[PDB]
Design a protein around this ligand. Structure first.
Ligand SMILES: OC[C@H]1O[C@@H](O[C@@H]2[C@H](O)[C@@H](O)[C@H](O)O[C@@H]2CO)[C@H](O)[C@@H](O)[C@H]1O
Ligand SMILES: OC[C@H]1O[C@@H](O[C@@H]2[C@H](O)[C@@H](O)[C@H](O)O[C@@H]2CO)[C@H](O)[C@@H](O)[C@H]1O
Ligand SMILES: OC[C@H]1O[C@@H](O[C@@H]2[C@H](O)[C@@H](O)[C@H](O)O[C@@H]2CO)[C@H](O)[C@@H](O)[C@H]1O
Lengths: 138, 152, 142
C-alpha cells in the first residue's frame, strides 16, 4: 500500500519578510563546516495564491560540505492532525530524502522524498516534493 | 570494501515489542536537570533554541520505580520541538540494545521509532506520549512503545 | 513478507579526525559546565575502501553528533563511487568509536534501507582515529 500523496511544495525561505528559518551557528573558517539552521518550512498541496497549507517541515539542517536535514513533516490537515512523517537526508533543494518513520495515520512509514526546484524568489524558493511512501497501517 | 547483495524477504511482524508503562523524566531545571539549551531563539524569527537532553526513563511511577534507560539526544524548537535521540537501555536483560526515536512534540503527541541496535535491530514503530505528572522542575511523560522487529 | 535485497558492506573505514591539518569536524556549541552536556560537533567524516596506499574515497559521513552523557549520532552516508554516486544511508545511533549504529533509511540504490551498522576501532592516530564499519541492512525491491 503506497500513500496516495499529491505533490507537495516546501517553502524554503532563508531570509526576507517571510523568513521561516534561522542560523544558530556559523561556519568555522579553518574547516569550512558547522553552520546549523533551524527551519519551520511551510508545505502546500499545490501552487498559486489559493494553494492551502497542509503540513510543516519542522527541524534543522547542518552544513558539513552539504546540508544534512532532519525534520518532522507534521500535517496541519483536519483529518490528519497529529500524524507526522519523519524525514532525514542530504541536500535541501535537489536530491532525495528518506522517510525514516511516521506517526498516527503514517505509523511505521517508510519511503523516499524526491526534491525538485520549482520557483526561485527574491528571498526564498519553492521545492517540489514527490513522496513514495509505504505504511503497513492495513 | 565489499558489498554483498542477497535477495530475501522481510517479516514485518517478526518480533513485536510492547513495553508499556514507561515514564520519561523531562527536567529542564533544578538540581536534577537532565538537559541544557545550547542556542537561543532568534528574536526576529522566533526559533532556533537547540536543547541537548539526557532524559532518564523509569519503569514506573513512585518510589519503587527503577531507572531502565536514558533518552540521549537533542530537540530543537522550530515552532515546535523536533526530537532526535537514542533510547539506550541500561537494564541487564537489554544492555546495549537501543531504540532510535524521532518525532515532534515532547509533552504529548506521538514519536516515531525509526530504528534500533542490538536486540532492537531494524525496529520500526511509534511511541505514544501522555502527560503523567507536572512537577516543579519539570514533568514526567508516560511513554507507550508499539514497535516490531522485522525478521530478515 | 516484503521482497527485497539484503545489503552487506564490509571493510569500510571512517576517518574521525577531531584535530590536525586533516580535521573533518568542528564543535559549534560548548558543553554546559553546570549540567555536563551540550557539545555539538558537525562532522564530514570520509569513508574509504581500505587502509593506507591509494585507498579510494567511497563515501562521506555528513551530519552531526551531540554530547548528552554520550554521543548521539545522526548523519547521511553519501557515497562518492561512480556506481553509488548520490545514494545515501541515513544513520542514527550512540557512540562513535565503538558500539552499534542503526540504519533508519536511505536514498538512491538504498531506498527504504533498514538495518544496523557495526563499528570497530582500527588505527588510533595522534590527530584522530579510523573506525571500521560493517553494514547489515535490508532494502525492499524497488
Ligand atoms: O540548502 C539549505 C541552505 O540553502 C542555502 O542556499 C540558498 C537557496 O536555498 C538556494 O536555492 C540558492 O540556490 O542559493 C541560496 C544560497 O546562495 C541558503 O542560503 C541557506 O539559508 C540554507 O537554507
Ligand atoms: O519540550 C521541551 C521544552 O519544553 C519547554 O516547556 C516547559 C515544560 O516542558 C512544559 O511542560 C511546560 O508546559 O512549559 C515549560 C516552559 O514554560 C521547556 O521550557 C524547554 O526547556 C524544553 O525542555
Ligand atoms: O565522539 C565524538 C568526540 O570524540 C572525541 O574522541 C576522542 C578520542 O577519539 C576518544 O577515544 C576519547 O574517548 O575521547 C577523545 C576526546 O576526549 C573527539 O576528540 C571529539 O572531537 C569528538 O569527535
Amino acid at each position: 500500500n503506497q500513500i496516495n500523496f499529491t505533490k507537495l511544495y516546501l517553502h524554503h525561505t532563508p531570509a526576507g519578510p517571510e523568513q521561516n528559518q534561522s542560523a544558530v551557528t556559523s561556519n568555522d573558517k579553518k574547516i569550512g563546516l558547522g553552520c546549523i539552521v533551524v527551519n519551520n518550512w511551510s508545505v502546500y498541496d499545490g501552487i498559486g495564491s489559493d494553494a492551502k497549507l497542509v503540513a510543516y517541515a519542522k527541524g534543522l539542517h547542518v552544513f558539513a560540505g552539504a546540508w544534512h536535514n532532519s525534520f518532522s513533516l507534521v500535517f496541519e490537515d483536519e483529518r490528519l492532525k497529529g500524524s507526522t512523517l519523519q524525514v532525514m537526508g542530504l541536500i535541501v533543494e535537489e536530491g532525495d530524502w528518506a522517510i525514516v518513520g511516521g506517526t498516527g495515520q503514517f505509523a511505521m512509514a517508510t519511503g523516499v522524498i524526491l526534491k525538485k526546484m520549482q520557483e526561485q524568489k527574491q528571498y526564498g524558493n519553492i521545492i517540489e516534493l514527490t513522496i513514495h511512501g509505504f505504511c503497513p497501517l492495513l
